[PDB]
């Protein structure tokens, strides 16, 4: 099934974005005075709460590239969760047509 295939592809891609985003955020934020997103472990946590939209506000990017990385994490997170929902819709719709006799 395509909907379950694209969903799985979205989840694995999300994990890649989370890891890479955690790596790129630190690389981008270091060098800017006052930045807190400068260590990998908490950067990964930041990526999670960002991708899930959430955004406690305990950690936030202050640089241009750190914020661009953030946007990518947001979109990847929203798209994946939106794709899972879309996949769940197809499963339920296809199932309802079966118990109806259509």
């Amino acid at each position, epitope marked *: 099934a395509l909907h379950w295939r694209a969903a799985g592809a979205a989840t694995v891609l999300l994990v890649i974005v989370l890891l890479a985003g955690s790596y790129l955020a630190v690389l981008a934020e*270091r060098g800017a005075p006052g930045a807190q997103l400068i260590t990998y472990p908490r950067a990964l946590w930041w990526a999670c709460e960002t991708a899930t939209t959430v955004x406690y506000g305990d950690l936030c990017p202050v640089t241009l590239w750190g914020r661009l990385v953030a946007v990518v994490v947001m979109v990847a997170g929203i798209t994946s969760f939106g794709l899972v929902t879309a996949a769940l819709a197809t499963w339920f719709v296809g199932r309802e047509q079966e118990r109806r006799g259509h």
Partner: antibody
Amino acid sequence: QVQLQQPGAELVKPGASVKLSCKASGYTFTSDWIHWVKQRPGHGLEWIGEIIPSYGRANYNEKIQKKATLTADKSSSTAFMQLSSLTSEDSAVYYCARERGDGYFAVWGAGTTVTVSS
Amino acid sequence: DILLTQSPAILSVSPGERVSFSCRASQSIGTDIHWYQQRTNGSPRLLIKYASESISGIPSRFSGSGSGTDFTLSINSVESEDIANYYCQQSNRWPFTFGSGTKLEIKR
């Protein structure tokens, strides 16, 4: 084994330049940052700058004079600090340290005693 | 940038007595503070990471505490080998900064 190997000493004439080395061993991750710390005789530790060998990007302490230039060689796992236009103020022991990207300096080098004199 | 204040600069104490080093940050840094030990003509050595976490190889004599602004490095019953300079370092905000340092002296 010694994780960070630095030269014992470096003699530099006033105005000249010097390229300190920091050969690294042990475990090496792409998340590793190499830092450099300056310590003048009778003074405390002073952060100079940092560099990530896996990407090559370096940051410097902008609170002090820009004397250093950080480069790295991923082939030999050795970090370098280019000090130029040295005066008597730059005469100190320069340590290099490894950070696993988690904030603390796990291991330090023996330190290179740089003396600026004619 | 974050200023780390270590007072007093020199700390005198009798042998076999508990001692405490102070480190105060100019801003709230949670528990992102790290302690180092530097003996005469030696390189700095990590004693405590993240305020209170212990380090492999370091005697259980050393301990750490504190959060936010005030932090403390403690030594239960000091020994002669503890004679050194003690520095604190923060990793909460860029750039990383060190404290002025505290010298430990033993009154034998």
